[PDB]
């Protein structure tokens, strides 16, 4: 009945997708020169944790970064010195996410209790203290990013996203159109709109203000394990678990490059473009990271510093460093 | 060779490091236990005998040990996602129906067997011993493969043999027991299994595989 009409509409939408694919970015830029072997030396080793670290986020200063572990700690590192500014003892050790406000006075992390805590750093008493506890979700919380000093965003394991309101502790909006579990999201350079992954090999482009998905790209194969916007907020290269990173076009509405290499068969676990939008970094389950060429797809220098799988990595705001975190419980600030 | 304030920051870093070390030391002296099992099959009984919408952590103790039993049963997502979080758990308690030889809910007994087979081959748990609690025995006293003797004490033995033979590794031993103990003997079985697991784990650190 209506399912047949939906399939017919999908046929039309895929036909439209194909009708505007004169180029591929592969034949173009063929004459463009490559980038020499990118060699990066482990500059600093931040070694404080005692167990696997599952997430981290770079502060706005490009100097302070926060990481979380199953040990039940949030240590606010200092990159230029390797010091520990703060150590926040968590309530539920099962933590699988972190954030950092554009201002330096808020940090949030909630992994498996279905609630994300909001912490206060710039407090008169001098001790970091919990500020709220958002408990509307019905599944394990995957990723959560601050939008402003208030209005956090979240995506949980029950196929929903929230866009909370910190002052009232209420779900102002609720995004729900996903068929399966949601595994990660990312905010655009401007906070106008964001995207989310899924476990059904699909991605959706939400709208922050009014709740409805605007576009759905289904060029992927197995899963989604990481998303991140390309600078200028138009591509948002996507992770994977089929060993094939991809980057779609928000305006052309179709997958574009599909980076891949035969030798590697592992699940990607994180991705984050570089400052100039030329490099595409990707942490792999194969115990070592990699650096791609965003415009030619050729591989580049390997980052074989770590021991166990890489879980999280992020380029700074100014692009002066690249931090990675593996289940070895060591953060390495490359450069 | 540092300024007036930087040395204070270094002192703060040292204090934080010492506090982290102290917290870590007193956290490896307790025993973890992941509690899996087919739903609606003798789980609440074990939990109750032992002593929000997610991980429920029971925190009992028994004879100088400090058990922390993470009863994960709330998540409705596929287990492939949050299972790896428990890769360093000293054991995986398991509860089966033992009453599914007749009901079909496919018989729950076969479903529990398949789940146990899946949990016994996961790459994460290829080294963690497993405990079986064949609970709901009083009511227990199809599945027609051989069952020749057909008696209670032979059907139970056959099912236990199936479960124990579902494993195929040499460095993980599967224990067994039946519940409905007069006292809190179920914890006693868990205590014995934990002691044996720790002994066998410390005997592999000095060679002597």
């Amino acid at each position, epitope marked *: 009945q209506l399912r047949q009409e939906a399939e017919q509409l999908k046929n039309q939408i895929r036909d439209a997708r194909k009708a505007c694919a004169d180029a591929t970015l592969s034949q173009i830029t063929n004459n463009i020169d490559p980038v020499g072997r990118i060699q990066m030396r482990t500059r600093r080793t931040l070694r404080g944790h005692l167990a696997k670290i599952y997430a981290m986020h770079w502060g706005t200063d490009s*100097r*302070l970064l926060v990481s979380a572990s199953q040990d039940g700690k949030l240590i606010i590192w*200092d990159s230029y*010195t390797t*010091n520990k*500014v*703060h150590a926040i003892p968590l309530r539920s050790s099962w933590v699988m996410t972190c954030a950092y406000a554009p201002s*330096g006075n808020y940090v949030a992390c909630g992994g498996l209790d279905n609630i994300c805590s909001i912490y206060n750093l*710039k407090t*008169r*008493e*001098g*001790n970091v203290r919990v500020s709220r506890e958002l408990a509307g979700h019905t599944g394990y919380l995957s990723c959560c990013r601050f939008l402003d000093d208030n209005q956090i965003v979240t995506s949980s394991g029950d196929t929903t996203c929230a866009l909370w309101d910190i002052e009232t502790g209420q779900q102002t909006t609720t995004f729900t159109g996903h068929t399966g579990d949601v595994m990660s999201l990312s905010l655009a350079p401007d906070t106008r709109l964001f995207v989310s992954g899924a476990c059904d090999a699909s991605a959706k482009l939400w709208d922050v203000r009014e709740g409805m998905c605007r576009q759905t790209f289904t060029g992927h194969e197995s899963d989604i394990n990481a998303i991140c916007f390309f600078p200028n907020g138009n591509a948002f290269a996507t992770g994977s678990d089929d060993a094939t990173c991809r980057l779609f076009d928000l305006r052309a509405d179709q997958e574009l490059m599909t980076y891949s290499h035969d030798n590697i068969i592992c699940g990607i676990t994180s991705v984050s473009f570089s400052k100039s939008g030329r490099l595409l970094l990707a942490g792999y389950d194969d115990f070592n990271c990699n650096v791609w060429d965003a415009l030619k797809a050729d591989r580049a220098g390997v980052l074989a510093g770590h021991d166990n799988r890489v879980s999280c990595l992020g380029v700074t705001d100014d692009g002066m460093a690249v931090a990675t975190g593996s289940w070895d419980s060591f953060l390495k600030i490359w450069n | 060779t540092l*300024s*007036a*304030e*930087e*040395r*204070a*920051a270094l*002192e*703060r870093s040292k*204090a934080i490091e010492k506090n982290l070390k102290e917290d870590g030391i007193s956290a490896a002296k307790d025993v973890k236990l992941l509690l899996l099992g087919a739903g609606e099959s003798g789980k609440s009984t074990i939990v109750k005998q032992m002593k929000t919408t997610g991980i429920v952590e029971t925190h009992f103790t028994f004879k100088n040990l400090h058990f922390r039993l993470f009863d994960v049963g709330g998540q409705r997502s596929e287990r492939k996602k949050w299972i790896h979080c428990f890769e360093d758990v000293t054991a995986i308690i398991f509860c089966v129906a033992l009453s599914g030889y007749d009901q079909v809910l496919t018989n729950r007994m076969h479903e529990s067997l398949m789940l146990f087979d899946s949990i016994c081959n996961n790459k994460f748990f290829i080294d963690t011993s497993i405990i079986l609690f064949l609970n709901k025995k009083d009511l227990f006293g199809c599945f027609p493969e051989y069952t020749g003797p057909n008696t209670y004490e032979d059907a139970a033995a056959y099912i236990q043999a199936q479960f124990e033979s579902k494993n195929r590794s040499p460095n993980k031993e599967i224990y067994c027991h039946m519940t409905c103990a007069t006292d809190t003997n179920n914890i006693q079985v868990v205590f014995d299994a934990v002691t044996d697991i720790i002994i066998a784990n410390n005997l592999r650190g000095c060679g002597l595989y």
Partner: single-chain antibody, 232 residues
Framework: DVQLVESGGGLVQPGGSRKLSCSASGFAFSSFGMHWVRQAPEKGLEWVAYISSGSGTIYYADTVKGRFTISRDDPKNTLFLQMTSLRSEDTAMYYC??????????????WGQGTTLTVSDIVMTQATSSVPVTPGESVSISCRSSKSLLHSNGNTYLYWFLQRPGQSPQLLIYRMSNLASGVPDRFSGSGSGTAFTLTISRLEAEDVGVYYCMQHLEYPLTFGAGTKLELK
């Protein structure tokens, strides 16, 4: 609310001994660095002692070295100071402050009250102590050092403090470029690697106190001469 109060203020004779103390209740006192600062009937405002978070660092002022002892116990949130060989030069009212040192922190936040008692280094000067002024305009203070105050870390440790008449002072500007929370935006700070100055625009009926400037590049923090502002 945050408050620090003193315990022992009394009349003592030269050649005895007396012990000071304060009580803190509003914050997590167990992880703070507490200073001691003295004064005088004159504008004189000088450094006294110090104690760090873990009690592993204790500095002093050479003028009282070997006579003044400092110590505190975290569980009671109480600081103790012991004095001996009390000369008439010691007569002054002793303040007590707090300071927490980490990247991005503001030392010397909350200045408490003080007790009344009776009986090379860096040098800074503040010329033109007296400065007539009227409301509806800006002003400019300045204190100068004798050694470059710009450290290689990129920071320039220099603080400012305002003291209202009959009242303990409060932090005004730290590192000559940052404002302590709650201070209105009229105040501002700047300076080169050797010279420093403020710009207090739109003077109101409240900015009437005296100003001092601290140097923290070397731990014997030594303040500058007072620069009072009347309302001629």
């Amino acid at each position: 609310d945050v408050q620090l109060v003193e315990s022992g203020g009394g009349l003592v004779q030269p050649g005895g001994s007396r012990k000071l103390s304060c009580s803190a209740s509003g914050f997590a006192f167990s992880s703070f660095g507490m200073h001691w600062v003295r004064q005088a009937p004159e504008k004189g405002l000088e450094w006294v002692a110090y104690i760090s978070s873990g009690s592993g660092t204790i500095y002093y002022a050479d003028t009282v070295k070997g006579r003044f002892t400092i110590s505190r116990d975290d569980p009671k949130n109480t600081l103790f100071l012991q004095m001996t060989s009390l000369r008439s030069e010691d007569t002054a009212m002793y303040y007590c402050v707090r300071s927490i040192y980490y990247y991005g922190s503001s030392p010397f936040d909350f200045w408490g009250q003080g007790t009344t008692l009776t009986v090379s280094d860096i040098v800074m000067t503040q010329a033109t102590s007296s400065v007539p002024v009227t409301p509806g305009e800006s002003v400019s203070i300045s204190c100068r050092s004798s050694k470059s105050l710009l450290h290689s870390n990129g920071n320039t440790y220099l603080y400012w403090f305002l003291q209202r008449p009959g009242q303990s002072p409060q932090l005004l500007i730290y590192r000559m470029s940052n404002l302590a929370s709650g201070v209105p935006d009229r105040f501002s700070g700047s300076g080169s690697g050797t010279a420093f100055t403020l710009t207090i625009s739109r003077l109101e009926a409240e900015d009437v106190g005296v100003y001092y400037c601290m140097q923290h590049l070397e731990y014997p923090l030594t303040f500058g001469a007072g620069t009072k502002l009347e309302l001629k």
